[PDB]
């Protein structure tokens, strides 16, 4: 199937508590592979997946060098954005950056991304055509013009269609043994009376990868989205994911209900019944 490489930057100012803190993480699909933490002792871009460790010292020197540079850029942008919004010197603020590319099964470019945020909300985003910007507010309009005057959209597109996709392909190759497997969900169901009239049926999906999955309840073959509870898909801590969906049913009626599980790793979608 398809694949993506994605970088996430977080800069948080802390007035009085010293200089801003910077975290960078890199993902290929749902697997983290690199990390930088400006407060950590190493001051190096660090590996987080085995297949990236096979990159030489020169790779790590350049990655370290560029991530540090990015952190300085965010540092002054933090001050600059404080001016745009006329914010005081003493509050804590946040810049977030996400960018990356998608490739198809053949390895071809599909799409690129670049989005920034300030204090948890949209600031500026590269549009689908990778050719223009959408500025959410008035302070970002100023930034939008600086970037038009710098032709930053071309430069973004240069990375997204160039180094991004080709290092994605590289990583996918160097990590084929792990990044191209689909672990299908191991499913089970639990059953707990709530009272003498009702019981909970809970449908579990465990140990799956990638994270994309669908759990749905049915009653007599029709979708039931009512007296159901879906939890957010969650990391197990070992590279795989978990999810569950529960339904409260009338006692003696549990045989009417089916849980359906759709996952890429399944030859065909499962149906579970108590």
């Amino acid at each position: 199937g398809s694949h993506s490489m994605r970088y996430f930057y977080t800069s948080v100012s802390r007035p009085g508590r010293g200089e801003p803190r910077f975290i960078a993480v890199g993902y290929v699909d749902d697997t983290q592979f690199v990390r930088f933490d400006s407060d950590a002792a190493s001051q190096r871009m660090e590996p987080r997946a085995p297949w990236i460790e096979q990159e030489g010292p020169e790779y790590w020197d350049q990655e370290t060098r560029n991530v540090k540079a990015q952190s300085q850029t965010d540092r002054v942008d933090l001050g600059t954005l404080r001016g745009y919004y006329n914010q005081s010197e003493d509050g804590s603020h946040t810049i977030q950056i996400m960018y990356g590319c998608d490739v198809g099964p053949d390895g071809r470019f599909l799409r690129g991304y670049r989005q920034d945020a300030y204090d948890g909300k949209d600031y500026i985003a590269l549009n689908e055509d990778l050719r223009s910007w959408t500025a959410a507010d008035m302070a970002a309009q100023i930034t939008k013009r600086k970037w038009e005057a710098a032709h930053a959209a071309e430069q973004q597109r240069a990375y997204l269609e160039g180094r991004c996709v080709e290092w994605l392909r590289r990583y996918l190759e160097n990590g084929k043994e792990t990044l191209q497997r689909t672990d299908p969900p191991k499913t089970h169901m639990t059953h707990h009376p709530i009272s003498d009239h009702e019981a909970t049926l809970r449908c579990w999906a465990l140990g799956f990868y990638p994270a994309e999955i669908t759990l749905t309840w049915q009653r007599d073959g029709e979708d039931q989205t009512q007296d159901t509870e879906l939890v957010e898909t969650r990391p197990a801590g070992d590279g795989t994911f978990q999810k569950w969906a529960a339904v409260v049913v009338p006692s003696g009626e549990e045989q009417r209900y089916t849980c359906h599980v759709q996952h890429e790793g399944l030859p065909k979608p499962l149906t579970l019944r108590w």
């Binding site: 970088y7 960078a24 890199g26 790779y59 350049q62 990655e63 560029n66 991530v67 540079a69 990015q70 850029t73 002054v76 942008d77 600059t80 954005l81 950056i97 960018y99 920034d116 600031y123 500026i124 930034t143 600086k146 970037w147 710098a150 930053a152 430069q155 973004q156 240069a158 990375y159 997204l160 180094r163 991004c164 290092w167």
Partner: peptide, 11 residues
């Protein structure tokens, strides 16, 4: 590998 081109895009 991270994009070098972002480093200069000051806001």
């Amino acid at each position: 590998t991270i994009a070098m081109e972002l480093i200069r895009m000051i806001k």
